[PDB]
Short mmCIF file of N, CA, C and O in Angstrom, two decimals:
data_model
loop_
_atom_site.label_atom_id
_atom_site.label_comp_id
_atom_site.label_asym_id
_atom_site.label_seq_id
_atom_site.Cartn_x
_atom_site.Cartn_y
_atom_site.Cartn_z
N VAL A 1 -5.66 -1.77 17.05
CA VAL A 1 -6.86 -0.62 17.33
C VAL A 1 -6.49 0.27 16.64
O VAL A 1 -5.24 1.02 16.67
N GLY A 2 -7.51 0.93 15.67
CA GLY A 2 -7.39 2.06 15.38
C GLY A 2 -7.60 2.07 13.77
O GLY A 2 -8.56 2.59 13.11
N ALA A 3 -6.55 1.40 12.94
CA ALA A 3 -6.76 1.64 11.35
C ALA A 3 -6.21 0.32 10.79
O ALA A 3 -4.97 -0.28 11.18
N UNK A 4 -6.30 -0.43 9.71
CA UNK A 4 -5.94 -1.40 8.48
C UNK A 4 -6.56 -2.62 9.16
O UNK A 4 -7.63 -2.78 8.17
N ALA A 5 -6.36 -3.41 10.02
CA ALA A 5 -7.63 -4.63 10.21
C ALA A 5 -7.30 -5.00 12.06
O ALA A 5 -6.37 -4.88 12.66
N UNK A 6 -8.29 -5.15 11.98
CA UNK A 6 -8.75 -5.18 13.89
C UNK A 6 -9.73 -4.39 14.32
O UNK A 6 -11.00 -4.64 13.32
N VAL A 7 -10.09 -3.60 14.93
CA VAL A 7 -11.37 -2.59 15.34
C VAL A 7 -10.92 -1.25 15.32
O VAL A 7 -10.24 -0.34 15.77
N UNK A 8 -11.63 -0.42 14.73
CA UNK A 8 -11.61 1.18 13.90
C UNK A 8 -11.88 0.95 12.45
O UNK A 8 -13.34 0.71 12.16
N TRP A 9 -10.86 1.25 11.87
CA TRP A 9 -11.35 1.13 10.13
C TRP A 9 -10.44 0.26 9.53
O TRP A 9 -9.21 0.09 9.45
N UNK A 10 -11.11 -0.14 8.44
CA UNK A 10 -10.69 -1.03 7.38
C UNK A 10 -11.31 -2.55 7.24
O UNK A 10 -12.40 -3.13 6.88
N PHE A 11 -10.93 -3.58 8.23
CA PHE A 11 -10.94 -4.96 8.15
C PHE A 11 -11.26 -5.36 9.61
O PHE A 11 -10.70 -4.71 10.72
N UNK A 12 -12.12 -6.52 9.91
CA UNK A 12 -12.26 -6.71 11.29
C UNK A 12 -13.88 -5.97 11.71
O UNK A 12 -14.89 -6.45 11.65
N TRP A 13 -13.82 -5.27 12.73
CA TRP A 13 -14.92 -4.34 13.36
C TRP A 13 -14.76 -2.64 13.25
O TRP A 13 -13.52 -1.99 13.34
N UNK A 14 -15.92 -2.20 13.35
CA UNK A 14 -16.05 -0.52 13.18
C UNK A 14 -16.62 -0.04 11.90
O UNK A 14 -17.48 -0.18 11.29
N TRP A 15 -15.73 0.37 11.17
CA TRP A 15 -15.86 1.01 9.63
C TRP A 15 -15.02 1.16 8.52
O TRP A 15 -14.01 -0.15 8.73
N UNK A 16 -14.67 1.16 7.32
CA UNK A 16 -14.04 1.04 6.23
C UNK A 16 -14.84 -0.18 5.60
O UNK A 16 -15.90 -0.18 4.85
N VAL B 1 -3.32 -4.57 13.23
CA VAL B 1 -2.54 -4.54 12.65
C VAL B 1 -2.47 -3.47 11.27
O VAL B 1 -3.56 -3.65 10.62
N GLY B 2 -1.68 -2.87 11.42
CA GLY B 2 -1.57 -1.63 10.03
C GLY B 2 -1.40 -0.44 10.65
O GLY B 2 -0.27 0.26 10.47
N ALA B 3 -2.43 0.31 11.41
CA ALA B 3 -2.21 2.13 11.98
C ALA B 3 -2.98 1.93 13.13
O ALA B 3 -4.08 1.44 13.70
N UNK B 4 -2.44 2.86 14.12
CA UNK B 4 -3.40 3.58 15.17
C UNK B 4 -2.34 2.65 16.33
O UNK B 4 -1.31 3.47 16.66
N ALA B 5 -2.88 1.40 16.78
CA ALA B 5 -2.22 1.00 17.83
C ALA B 5 -1.83 -0.87 17.81
O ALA B 5 -3.47 -1.11 17.41
N UNK B 6 -1.12 -1.41 17.89
CA UNK B 6 -0.57 -2.85 17.43
C UNK B 6 0.55 -2.89 16.68
O UNK B 6 1.68 -2.45 17.24
N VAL B 7 0.68 -3.07 15.70
CA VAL B 7 1.53 -3.61 14.68
C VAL B 7 1.57 -2.89 13.09
O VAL B 7 0.70 -3.40 12.92
N UNK B 8 2.35 -1.92 12.96
CA UNK B 8 2.03 -1.26 12.11
C UNK B 8 3.12 -0.12 12.22
O UNK B 8 4.12 0.59 12.67
N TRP B 9 1.92 0.98 12.25
CA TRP B 9 2.48 2.45 12.49
C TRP B 9 1.43 3.28 13.59
O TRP B 9 0.30 3.17 13.89
N UNK B 10 2.31 3.90 14.81
CA UNK B 10 1.65 4.89 15.93
C UNK B 10 2.31 3.84 17.13
O UNK B 10 3.09 4.63 17.73
N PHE B 11 1.57 2.99 17.85
CA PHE B 11 1.93 2.53 19.16
C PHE B 11 1.91 1.14 18.98
O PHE B 11 1.55 0.68 18.42
N UNK B 12 2.90 0.48 19.85
CA UNK B 12 3.10 -0.75 19.96
C UNK B 12 4.51 -1.23 19.36
O UNK B 12 5.17 -1.30 19.84
N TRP B 13 4.75 -1.75 18.15
CA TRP B 13 5.42 -2.23 17.48
C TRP B 13 5.46 -1.81 15.91
O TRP B 13 4.62 -1.28 15.17
N UNK B 14 6.83 -1.39 15.54
CA UNK B 14 6.83 -1.17 13.73
C UNK B 14 7.63 0.45 13.92
O UNK B 14 8.70 0.78 13.68
N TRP B 15 6.66 1.29 13.33
CA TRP B 15 7.08 2.91 13.09
C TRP B 15 5.76 3.71 13.73
O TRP B 15 4.99 3.43 14.58
N UNK B 16 6.62 5.16 13.47
CA UNK B 16 5.30 6.26 14.33
C UNK B 16 6.04 6.52 15.51
O UNK B 16 6.94 7.01 15.66
#
């Protein structure tokens, strides 16, 4: 949750 | 995985 990989920014879900 | 909350930086495991 937040940034890198998961839900948030970068990879997986959300943005980036 | 990476940053915010989980394993990596901020909350949960690793650093921050």
